[PDB]
Each structure stands twice: as structure tokens, then as C-alpha cells.
């Protein structure tokens, strides 16, 4: 009953920049697939 | 009084210059409070050899105590074996994401 | 026209120890259990608003095309003080990419702190000792802790675990810097020696000669090559690596060099002590022999009213110079060169 | 020095519980080491909890949390609610004091003349 | 060059605290080791405090310190003193003291207390400033005597700025703002007391930095004062110049001075007051001087006597300061109950 306390946002923001990171990690391995596209072209 | 010459003594012997005094007075009563913890040891152990004195005996085992008790250090012996245990182990993984720092 | 020009933050005492990296803030470990950030030429920014709700993380997702101005959601103000510790911080620095922040107390905790939450990311131990240095790799996966207990040890990201140590002097270790290049690592101590360290194997790769007193300050240089060891003699050692060569000698600081910096590239030393001092050094040194000598007048000082000099900077990217000064105010003051 | 009116503020604290208790005289040299005491054990609490709620990877220390730490620094908050009784319905609160000000100036000259010549940095003030 | 010898307690005086818990008959040496053993630890922990001061970087040791280390055939033409530059800042400096907008003025006054280094646009500056207080005191002008007043003000607080070499041409230029015929127009008298009260308030403020020398601030103005107020049959500006003068200079001064002066002022009151047939200037003037005099004497009187009788104090003030004085003793005893 932690209607005092959030005792949040931070582990959970762990996971927010763990959400970042994996936004920026796939958009790295849609420039791997995109440089490997450019030899494709 | 004498104990504030007793401590500029020290710290010209300390060489270094700019304090306040109430530091100084404070160092020298809470250190003179430790002797008399050493004056409480050396009542048990005259206690405890069932004798009215204090030896150089009962000295020698109170600073013993009390050396074992406030003067820490990291024994160099350890140091090499901790230098042996870790400088030994060459691991060093690479990996591609390093955003993450963690696994409390 | 070389000139001091200055700032003006806020007007407290208690200050420690204070580093910059990348110019648009500065790290004030100040009031003993504290550590302060202040912004250069930016308003503020609060990145975590975003984090504050998982739906406002779904929100900045759903702008996860290519939008990361819309990452923060700035909320919050600038000026902000960073607290867990309990002890007088003794060090810090950023990350140069600017992500992780480093606090380095008294109270054997070490912490890297969020640059978007400002709190302790990760906080941890290795001492119930001071632990006097600490320093980012110039790339930033590792960085080096050296403290109280003689030792000197590598920490990962993410690894908690000490991944060396390089207990090799015999007392307080004082200052510790990596190479450039993020492989070799310089730890100069309380038993007045300098060793140099390696990242493979660990052991003292090199030693440097004891100058007559405690250090308190060492660099290298932008290409890599070259050292200045500043110590309680008021006295600069110019140092080479692989030669191993105490080349270059100044002095006249009066004992206490607290801020050396090899400038941008070229032989330009900005240098700072204790008594309100700083001096350029123009002092092109270079040689290749067997031994050595040299001489003084190569540059004239700059002097200050009260504000002893924690840290400095050669200005990264551009010919300029701040200074950070701690007995008035958190004055960060900025002086240019030239000649 | 200017720290130390927090501490001389400990001290009112001290004898605002000695006025509730009712002593008319005392040693002063043993009050402000009391007084001392009672700082110490403020930051002891504040250790005990610092290292207990790093137990959590978050930091946040909660009401509970600091339960178990003044059970654990061996007190009954059984006798919390009863004492409120004694504490803020028979000692009147003093209020701080902090007197803070940033004072006006004006020197105008005309004359600036290179606001961010060749080693350009938008992060100054040129002074004349 | 040096000799670090023990600094051992008087094992006597140890024994006396030994045996105030009432311990035993001691032997010496056992106290002296005991002196020794604690002296070690004592001084190791002052050179380990030494070593935390010394990286958090200040020469003074607190207690907080400590308690952090318990963790255990032609010439040349000539160039003058000024450059270009700072000569057009000087001519800022001058027409800003013309300057209408009050804004403009304060900033004259503050870039005037708070120019330190300038040094160098001194004298020529307040050379002919003190020439224009002459010009301007036959053009008797309240405006520009305002303004070099609270010019001097400024000029008095801007502290590196050493008068002494410089005092003695800008005093007598004061003076001749405190003596007399400060006349812009006969009703406008009114601004010109004033004037002399902020005149003598900084002769006040001159007057506790320069007589310990040579004698002419204090004795050459006292001696002034003296035969000035002597001077029978002048205009009355040069009375409440005098006087006010006086009275600035302190509480004894004016107890040395208006202990007869009392009376014999109070003849003077009464030679203006119940006196002449129709000089209503001059009785008004003359007048509120008077009062002010009065009741700006009166806090040495109420400092030294006590306030009883003042039927008997105003006998014993000729009667005119009754009770006037009486009413400035009830108000010095409201002053007193405010404390």
C-alpha cells in the first residue's frame, strides 16, 4: 500500500534508456542492413 | 594554558601553519580522553594480574589492543596477492551495446 | 589581447574539486557531500520527464524515428545539486560522450551519475578507504580509481568488480590519469614516485623518479607523448615515456601545482597553484640523446585575489582557457594566449 | 563560521527539550557536546539508512525503511503518536533564519569591440 | 636546518589525571612511553589530516577534517598618463557626474567605489574636480555640489585607492562646502543644510583614517571649528557648518566641546530667539539650526546625564533646550526601550 511512496522511476528508467538504446542499437542494425543494402545497390 | 604551547610545539613540529584553535583544543581533549581509556585498560589488566600496579607489561599489551583496534593499514603481502589474484586474470570482453551498466 | 575574463555562479564555500569536460558544464564537487553541476551558454534540460512515465517513454517511441530533441520533454531547471554520499567528494569528471557522470568521495563509494535522471546510476565500493582520483578513459568504457589504500584499480561499465590493481607504491595515492590512447595509466602517490601502468598484464610498466615531495598533479599530452608532473616543490617535471627522461624543470608556483594542462597540441602550458597563480609555460622542448639539461624564462604569470585553482581546462576545440576558482565563489574564469 | 549558526540552532533545539523537561540550570560546555551528540546521531541515522536503501538498486528511502533502521538503532515508535503529544502540542516550533540578497551595480562603459574574435566562444564576457 | 623533538607532556601533570580516577602510585617512565605512544598516534593523524586538507585544498585545518580522519636636439613628444581609451572613460566618467539620469549617476557612483586598480585616472580627476567645487562655489550651484559630494563619497569607499599622498587638495574642498554661503536662492536655503550634514558626515568618515600622522585632520579641523564658531558676526551657514562638523566628529568631541558650549549656544538661542526687530531669513534659518543643533547634541547629554529634572536640566541648559532637550530625552529613553 504504497500510497505514500512511488518508489519508481529509476530501475524503470533503467528501462527507459534500455528502450533508448535499443531505438538507437536497432536503428545501428538498420545501418548494418543499410550499408549492406548500399553493396546490394 | 601549557597544553596549547604542548600542541604549537607540535604543529611547528607538524611545519605547516594556518588552523583554528578550537580544533587544536578539541583534538587535545578528546586525545586525552584516549589516555584515559588507556589508564581504564591499564586498571583491568592490573585487575586481571591481580596487581595494585601497572607494568610496562600491561602498556605494551593495551597499545597492542588498541593498535589492533584504530591504526588499520593494508598489508603489503596482501597487496601482491591481490596483485597475483586479479593482474593474473587477463579478461576483458568486448561487447557491441555498452549503454547498460549493470545487474544489481 | 590575452585576457581574464569572468563569470559569476553561485557564491558559497566548501568547494573540493571541480572538472569540465566538453565545455558546456562543469562539475562542482563542493559542500561535503555534494555534487553540483552548473551549465555553460545552455538553458537546462530534463531528459527524464520522458522516463517519468512508461507511457511518456511510449510517447518519445512513438517520435523514435528520428527525433532526438524530443527525447527530453524538459521539465526541470539548471544549477542542480547531486547527492547520496556522505563524505567530502574528492573527484570527478563527465563521460566524453557525456552520459556518465563520475563522483568520487571520501566515503570509499564511487558513483556514476545518470546524465538524464542526475542520479546514482550505479554506486559502489572497493575500499572502506578515501578515494582520492578518479578519471574517465578518453573513450569511457573503463575508467581508473586510485585512493587511500596504495592500490590502483580499473572499473568497467558495468562489470562491479575491480579488473586490476596496480598496488605497486606504498601509500596515498594522489593523482591516476589514462593515456590518450586508453591502454596505459600514470598513478602518482604520497611516497613522491610516479608509476606508469599497463592494461594487460597490470604490472609497472615504468617509474618515474621521486621529486622531493607529494604529488599533486600529473598530464600527458594531446599527442600522447609527453608529461608534466607537478609537485609540492612548487617544481614541473617535464617527463618522457620511452626514453623515461625527467627532460624539463619549472618552478617558481610556491608549492603547491594544483592544475597543469598541456594546452591544444603545440608545447603551450597552462599551469596553476595554490597562491592564486597561474602561468603560461611557452616552452618548445624537444630532443632525442642520452642525458639532459635545460634552463628557465620561458613565460610570465597571471596572478588572482583569493580563489586557489581545483582544476582547468585547455579549451577543447578551439585556442582558449578556463579555470575554476574556489575561495570567493564558483567562478569559473576564462583567460585566453597567444604569443 | 557561517556554517555554524545550524549548529547554534541544534543548540535552541536543545534547550527548547530542556525548557519541556524543566531544567533551570546546566553545564554548558556538556550541553553543546549533547548538542553534538544529537548531530552525530542525525547522521548516524542518516548512514544506517544510506547503506540500508542501497539494498534496493533505487535509492529512495521510504517510511518503513526507516522503521526497521530505528528498530534497528534500538527505538519503540510505539511511544511516536504519544510523544506527539509532548512535541509539537507542548514545545513551540522556532523558525530559521537565512538572510540572502544579490546587490545592484551598473559600470557602463562603451567599449566591447571583439565579442567572439578569433578564438570564438559564445560563453563569455568580453569587459571592455 | 631542522630539529623535531618530542613534544612529551609532563608526566607529573599525567599522573594528576591518571590519579584524579584514582588509579595507583605511577612510576615516571611509564607516563613518559604512555606521552610517547599517544604522541605517535597523535602526530601520524595530524599528518594524515594534513594529507586530506591537502587534497581537498585549504591551509587550515577544521575540526570536520579530523573528524574525517577518525575513519580508523629636439625630445620626443611626450605621452601622458592616460591612454586614449581610458581618457574617454574619464570624460564618461565627467559628464555622467553632470549626468540627469539618476540611472547614469548611480552607475558613475558605483564604477567610482567599485574601480580599484584605476589609480592612474587619479589626481588629474579629482584635481580639477576640486577646481570645479571652486569655480562652482562662485557659481554657487547646490546641483553640482550634490554631485561631487556624493562623488567624493564614492571616491572615499573605492578602498585600493590610498588618499594619503593625495589628501591635500580635495579637504579644503570639502570644507568650502561646509562653511557658508551656499546661497542658490534665500528660500532655498532649505537643501544647502542638508548638504552641509552629508559635508560633515564625510569628514566624519575621513577623520578615522589619517590623524594618527601629522595632526592636521584632528587638530587643524577641531582648531577650525573652534575659532570658527568663535567668529562673531557671521552668517549663520558658518555656525551650522561648524557644529555639525563637530558633532560628527564624536560623542567625547562634543563632550568636550558644547560642555560650555551649552549655555553659552543657548545665549546664542536667545539672542536669535526674543531678538531682533525683523530678519525673518535669518531668524528662520538661524532658528531651525538651532533645533537641529539641539536636538542632534542632545544623545551625548542623555548618554551622559541621566534623565531626571528637566526643570532642572533646562536651569542647567539655560532653559531654551527645555524641553526640547526634555523631549529628546524621552525620545533617546524610547531608543533605549527599543533596545
Not at chain 2, 596487581?51 to 601482491?80: E, G, M, N, Y
Not at chain 5, 572615499?156 to 568650502?176: F, G, Q, R, S, W
Request: proline share 4%; glycine share 6%; aromatic share 8%.
Amino acid at each position: 500500500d504504497d500510497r505514500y511512496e512511488q518508489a519508481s522511476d529509476v530501475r524503470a528508467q533503467l528501462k527507459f534508456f534500455e528502450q533508448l538504446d535499443q531505438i538507437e542499437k536497432q536503428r545501428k542494425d538498420e545501418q548494418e542492413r543499410e550499408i549492406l543494402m548500399r553493396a546490394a545497390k | 594554558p601549557k597544553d596549547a604551547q604542548m600542541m604549537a610545539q607540535i604543529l611547528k613540529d607538524m611545519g605547516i601553519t594556518e588552523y583554528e584553535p578550537r580544533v587544536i583544543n578539541q583534538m587535545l581533549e578528546f586525545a586525552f580522553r584516549y589516555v584515559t581509556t588507556i589508564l581504564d585498560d591499564a586498571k583491568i589488566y592490573s585487575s586481571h594480574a591481580k596487581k595494585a600496579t601497572v607494568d610496562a607489561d600491561d602498556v605494551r599489551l593495551a597499545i597492542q589492543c588498541r593498535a589492533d583496534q584504530s591504526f588499520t593499514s593494508p598489508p603489503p603481502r596482501d597487496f601482491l596477492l591481490d596483485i597475483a589474484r586479479q593482474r593474473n586474470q587477463t579478461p576483458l570482453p568486448l561487447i557491441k551495446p555498452x549503454x547498460x551498466x549493470x545487474x544489481x | 589581447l590575452p585576457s581574464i575574463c569572468f563569470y559569476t555562479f553561485l557564491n558559497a564555500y566548501q568547494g573540493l574539486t571541480a572538472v569540465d569536460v566538453t565545455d558546456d558544464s562543469s562539475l562542482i564537487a563542493g559542500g561535503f557531500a555534494d555534487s553540483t553541476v552548473r551549465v555553460x551558454x545552455x538553458x537546462x534540460x530534463x531528459x527524464x520527464x520522458x522516463x517519468x512515465x512508461x507511457x511518456x517513454x511510449x510517447x518519445x517511441x512513438x517520435x523514435x524515428x528520428x527525433x532526438x530533441x524530443x527525447x527530453x520533454x524538459x521539465x526541470x531547471x539548471x544549477x542542480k545539486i547531486l547527492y547520496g554520499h556522505s563524505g567530502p567528494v574528492y573527484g570527478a569528471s563527465f563521460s566524453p560522450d557525456r552520459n556518465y557522470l563520475l563522483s568520487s568521495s571520501e566515503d570509499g563509494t564511487v558513483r556514476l551519475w545518470s546524465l538524464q535522471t542526475f542520479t546514482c546510476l550505479v554506486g559502489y565500493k572497493g575500499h572502506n578507504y578515501p578515494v582520492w582520483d578518479t578519471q574517465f578513459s578518453p573513450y569511457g568504457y573503463y575508467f581508473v580509481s586510485g585512493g587511500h589504500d596504495r592500490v590502483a584499480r580499473l572499473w568497467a561499465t558495468d562489470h562491479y568488480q575491480p579488473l586490476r590493481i596496480f598496488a605497486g607504491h606504498l601509500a596515498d595515492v594522489n593523482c591516476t590519469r589514462f593515456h590518450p590512447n586508453s591502454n596505459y595509466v600514470a598513478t602518482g602517490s604520497a611516497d613522491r614516485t610516479v608509476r606508469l601502468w599497463d592494461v594487460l598484464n597490470g604490472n609497472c610498466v615504468r617509474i618515474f623518479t621521486g621529486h622531493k615531495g607529494p604529488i599533486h598533479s600529473l598530464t600527458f599530452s594531446p599527442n600522447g607523448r609527453f608529461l608534466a608532473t607537478g609537485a609540492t616543490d612548487g617544481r614541473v617535471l617535464l617527463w618522457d615515456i620511452g626514453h623515461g627522461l625527467m627532460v624539463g624543470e619549472l618552478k617558481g608556483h610556491t608549492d603547491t601545482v594544483c592544475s597543469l594542462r598541456f594546452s591544444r597540441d603545440g608545447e603551450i602550458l597552462a599551469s596553476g597553484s595554490m597562491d592564486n597563480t597561474v602561468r603560461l609555460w611557452d616552452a618548445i622542448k624537444a630532443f632525442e640523446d642520452l642525458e639532459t639539461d635545460d634552463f628557465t624564462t620561458a613565460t610570465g604569470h597571471i596572478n588572482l585575489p583569493e580563489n586557489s585553482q581545483e582544476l582547468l581546462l585547455g579549451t577543447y576545440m578551439t585556442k582558449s582557457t578556463p579555470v575554476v576558482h574556489l575561495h570567493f565563489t564558483r567562478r569559473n574564469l576564462v583567460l585566453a594566449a597567444g604569443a | 563560521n557561517y556554517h555554524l549558526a545550524r549548529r547554534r540552532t541544534l543548540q535552541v533545539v536543545v534547550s527548547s527539550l530542556l525548557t519541556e523537561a524543566g531544567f533551570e540550570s546546566a553545564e554548558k560546555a556538556s550541553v553543546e557536546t549533547l548538542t553534538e551528540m544529537l548531530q552525530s546521531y542525525i547522521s548516524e541515522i542518516g548512514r544506517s539508512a544510506k547503506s540500508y536503501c542501497e539494498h534496493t538498486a533505487r535509492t529512495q528511502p521510504t517510511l518503513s525503511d526507516i522503521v526497521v533502521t530505528l528498530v534497528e538503532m534500538g527505538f519503540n515508535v510505539d511511544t511516536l503518536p504519544a510523544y506527539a503529544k509532548r512535541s509539537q502540542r507542548m514545545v513551540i516550533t522556532x523558525x530559521x533564519x537565512x538572510x540572502x540578497x544579490x546587490x545592484x551595480x551598473x559600470x557602463x562603459x562603451x567599449x566591447x569591440x571583439x565579442x567572439x574574435x578569433x578564438x570564438x566562444x559564445x560563453x563569455x564576457x568580453x569587459x571592455x | 636546518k631542522l630539529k623535531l623533538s618530542n613534544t612529551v607532556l609532563p608526566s607529573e601533570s599525567m599522573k594528576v589525571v591518571a590519579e584524579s580516577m584514582g588509579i595507583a602510585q605511577i612510576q615516571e617512565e611509564t607516563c613518559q612511553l604512555l606521552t610517547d605512544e599517544v604522541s605517535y598516534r597523535i602526530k601520524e593523524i595530524a599528518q594524515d589530516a594534513l594529507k586530506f586538507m591537502h587534497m581537498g585544498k585549504r591551509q587550515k585545518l577544521t575540526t570536520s577534517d579530523i573528524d574525517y580522519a577518525l575513519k580508523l636636439x629636439x625630445x620626443x613628444x611626450x605621452x601622458x598618463x592616460x591612454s586614449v581609451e581610458q581618457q574617454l572613460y574619464y570624460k564618461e566618467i565627467t559628464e555622467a557626474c553632470v549626468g540627469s539620469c539618476e540611472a547614469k549617476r548611480a552607475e558613475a557612483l558605483q564604477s567610482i567605489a567599485t574601480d580599484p586598480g584605476l589609480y592612474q585616472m587619479l589626481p588629474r580627476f579629482s584635481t580639477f574636480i576640486s577646481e570645479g567645487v571652486r569655480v562652482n562655489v562662485v557659481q554657487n550651484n547646490l546641483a553640482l555640489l550634490i554631485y561631487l559630494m556624493r562623488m567624493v563619497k564614492a571616491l572615499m569607499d573605492n578602498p585600493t585607492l590610498y588618499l594619503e599622498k593625495y589628501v591635500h587638495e580635495l579637504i579644503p574642498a570639502v570644507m568650502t562646502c561646509i562653511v557658508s554661503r551656499q546661497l542658490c536662492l534665500r528660500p532655498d536655503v532649505d537643501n544647502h543644510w542638508a548638504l552641509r550634514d552629508f559635508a560633515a558626515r564625510l569628514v566624519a568618515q575621513i577623520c578615522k583614517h589619517f590623524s594618527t600622522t601629522t595632526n592636521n585632520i584632528q587638530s587643524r579641523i577641531t582648531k577650525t571649528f573652534t575659532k570658527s564658531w568663535v567668529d562673531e558676526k557671521t552668517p549663520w551657514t558658518t555656525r551650522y557648518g561648524s557644529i555639525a562638523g563637530l558633532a560628527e566628529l564624536g560623542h567625547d568631541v562634543i563632550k568636550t566641546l558644547i560642555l560650555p558650549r551649552l549655555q553659552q549656544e543657548g545665549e546664542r538661542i536667545r539672542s536669535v530667539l526674543d531678538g531682533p526687530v525683523l530678519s525673518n531669513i535669518d531668524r528662520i534659518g538661524a532658528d531651525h539650526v538651532q533645533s537641529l543643533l539641539l536636538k542632534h547634541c542632545a544623545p551625548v547629554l542623555a548618554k551622559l546625564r541621566p534623565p531626571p529634572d528637566n526643570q532642572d536640566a533646562y536651569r542647567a541648559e539655560f532653559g531654551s533646550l527645555g524641553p526640547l532637550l526634555c523631549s529628546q530625552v524621552v525620545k533617546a529613553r524610547a531608543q533605549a526601550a527599543l533596545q
